Symmetry: C2
């Protein structure tokens, strides 16, 4: 049906030694032939991380890039440059970009149609902050985020959606598998009625936010929870345990 | 006296073969000893550029970084990972960053304090738009931008300032050798106000705004123009002509 995807966002972490030891353990882990693993390092180690990977199921992605591949856009990342180096994914739209780094939904929307225009796969994130949660505004916000992408992008084959309760981001208190299933399935029938039942049925919807070694098995029999976006334990050994969580 | 300095801000531009092509031209061309050349590629290509650099004057620097070193800040570059890959400089303030990406002056200041503290040199940019230019806001804008820094950073030994007349950067006109001289000299004495004659006497102010092979020699017997922050011509081969403009 859909393939189980485990994305590992490293974040502003990782040195050449630590990238050596993480992608060394992934080449040594015993994972299913039938699993999709994307490690997303800081751009300063993407080229290195692709030198190091020797397991076919693990491709490498960047964590942010800009919506034009060349020019005077100092400080920025480019899809063409990460692609040259051999990476196949870019995370667009993290709780650590939109809040702090002032990324407006249209900014992510336009960014997401140029990336797919360029061959790369996108990891798109959507998420409500605890007050939007306190006021029963979760779906109302997620649809608002998705709809800006939706007004721009119409083939979402190489798109994955990453739902991140902002209040579960690397706090240690995740959603329960049950709470997460409801919203995932809600996002999918919203995305059925906006894209088709076939495309809504192919799209992967990753849960993100305090996902870790021991709680991944509780999300084991959750149909609309197609994988995981692992931030904090992406740089821990229990990362293979979240990749073998349905194994 | 002040050492000649030539910074090469590549912006969002390059590929492995281009950065290979470019570093080899400097790796073998005639360049004065005691000139200071810093090439600033995209973050993806920083590690490789350092493996490629062989001519000692030439160090690599990153085009932008955050005010923290590790953590939850997706898409950001870290002062330590640039150091890890071996770049010795970070362009900050630079000017773009203020316009499209909205970096306020104090964001820059704090990022300069932390950056120097981390032991990485700062190329610091300053400048006014055509709207502060025709209004006659020029000097009080730069004094505000520099004052912001000045309150945080109280040692300026590994700082080079860059004045990008924003009415020139990528527009394709270089505001004269004469009014350039006068803006640098103005801002050298404002710094001397805030750090004494001593500090100001050794600090470098580089003219940014369209500098190139054909014209870098008309900035030659200009005293306060201590170097250049080349954008576009860094890619091109006249970048070598600009390291020899001052003979």
């Amino acid at each position: 049906a859909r393939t189980f995807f485990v994305g590992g966002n490293f974040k502003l972490n990782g040195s050449k030694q630590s990238i050596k030891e993480i992608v060394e353990r992934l080449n040594t882990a015993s994972i299913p032939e039938n699993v999709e693993v994307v490690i997303c390092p800081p751009a300063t180690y993407l080229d290195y991380s692709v030198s190091l990977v020797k397991k076919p199921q693990v491709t490498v992605g960047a964590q942010n890039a800009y919506l034009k591949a060349s020019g005077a856009f100092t400080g920025e990342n480019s899809v063409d440059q990460i692609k040259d180096v051999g990476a196949k994914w870019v995370i667009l739209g993290q709780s650590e970009r939109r809040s702090y780094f002032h990324e407006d939904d249209k900014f992510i929307a336009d960014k997401t149609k140029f990336a797919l225009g360029q061959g790369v796969g996108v990891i798109l994130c959507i998420g409500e902050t605890l007050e939007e949660k306190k006021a029963g505004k979760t779906l109302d916000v997620v649809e608002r985020q998705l709809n800006a992408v939706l007004e721009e992008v119409k083939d979402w084959t190489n798109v994955v959606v990453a739902y991140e309760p902002v209040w579960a981001i690397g706090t240690g208190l995740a959603a329960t598998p049950e709470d997460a299933q409801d919203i995932h399935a809600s996002i999918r029938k919203f995305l059925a009625s906006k894209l088709g039942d076939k495309a809504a049925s192919e799209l992967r919807i990753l849960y993100g936010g305090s996902a870790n070694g021991s709680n991944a098995v509780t999300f084991k029999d959750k149909a609309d929870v197609d994988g995981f976006l692992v931030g904090g334990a992406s740089l821990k050994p229990e990362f293979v345990d979240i990749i073998n969580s349905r194994n």
